[PDB]
Amino acid sequence: GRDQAGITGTWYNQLGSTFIVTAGADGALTGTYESAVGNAESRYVLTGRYDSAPATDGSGTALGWTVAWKNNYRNAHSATTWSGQYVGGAEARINTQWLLTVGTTEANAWKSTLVGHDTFTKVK
């Protein structure tokens, strides 16, 4: 991975959530997510993928990951996926949009999925 080192480490969103991730040379993302907002608590497992050979034209590095909101302490019966890109440099960022789906009855399916955005930085 060109940005395997850039991505690997700890990231913080604008809400104080904490995203610890290892980027493998094959394109794997693996780590933990600790949410600061919502119906979550400790750490949760995360897995995802990233482009391990990004364009060198100054473009960002596409990636995404999933957290299922079940751990030893909570089950929210829901999952969030983040889709975004890593932008390296002095103020490195991971810019994302996310989809959070809650398990629902078929009658409530139309309102199963929230959408939002998170900006992750290396500081805070």
Next chain:
Amino acid sequence: GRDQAGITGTWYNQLGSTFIVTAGADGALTGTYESAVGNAESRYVLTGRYDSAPATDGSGTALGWTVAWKNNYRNAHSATTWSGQYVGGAEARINTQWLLTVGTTEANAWKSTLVGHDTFTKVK
């Protein structure tokens, strides 16, 4: 996983894409995605997570997964995440929404991310 067997197997979306996945008892999703539409070709690795202890109130099972669109044949410098829920039964379904992010320059970041929806079935 309660629906570890329900989820594990091959799924087909309304476009003919093919989603082969193994659901682990710990909540891991792992498999391959073969797209029928877009700037993709063979199989791509996928990883994700699911709720391995869904509510038994008839609600669906939340899950999501990521594909980075890089394999031995293509690099689209992009990643898609699907967020949705598995609904078991005679006409089992995985109902999803997805976010596709393309690596972009900062000037083009505002248009980096497509949104869509996929319905997966066990047939077709």
Next chain:
Amino acid sequence: GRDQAGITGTWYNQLGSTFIVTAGADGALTGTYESAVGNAESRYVLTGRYDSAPATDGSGTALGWTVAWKNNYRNAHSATTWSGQYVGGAEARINTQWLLTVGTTEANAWKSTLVGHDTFTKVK
């Protein structure tokens, strides 16, 4: 409008909701929305815009509209916007994605917005 007549009329989504709209030659959409699902009841006012000079290359006609979920009978303190395109022909369709935002406290803002999709047809 090239599809001013194509768009103008009554549309039904996969849920049984009813969308009655007039497309003006200037690009205005105006009408009423009657929801079949959710925390809504009678008709609600809708307004929006459409491309009154679509490409003739077989492409669809971009449009969108908003409903605020307040009428004489209900106030859900929320608004939905549909973004999509009209596809003419024997099986004419309006294919959309929508965002539903609920008024929230700042603490709950991160979960203010649902995302979904609706397909509208001239029949049902």
Next chain:
Amino acid sequence: GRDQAGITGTWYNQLGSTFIVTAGADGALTGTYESAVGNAESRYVLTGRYDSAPATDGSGTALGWTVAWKNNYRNAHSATTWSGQYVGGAEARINTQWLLTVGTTEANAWKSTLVGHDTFTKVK
């Protein structure tokens, strides 16, 4: 409208786009949008709706609006809808998510719709 005066006026997003709007007492939004980014130029008409009787529990005021990207100078054959809420006070904000749909062939429909977010302020 409780926030008819709060909403009415000029708003600027983080990109420098300019959103001039009048909120009617019936819940109408009408105005112009002048984009600073993308394939747009001068002003474009906008119309939308807002909740003219928001909850007084400190919650925001739900609203949305549509711009079709056609004016006397440009036709992008596309439309954007913003869905969000107005938050009053010393640092008043309109927090939104948006969907931009481009008219496409049926073969390209799956990639017709971009998603993003805009934060509007009274300054800048």
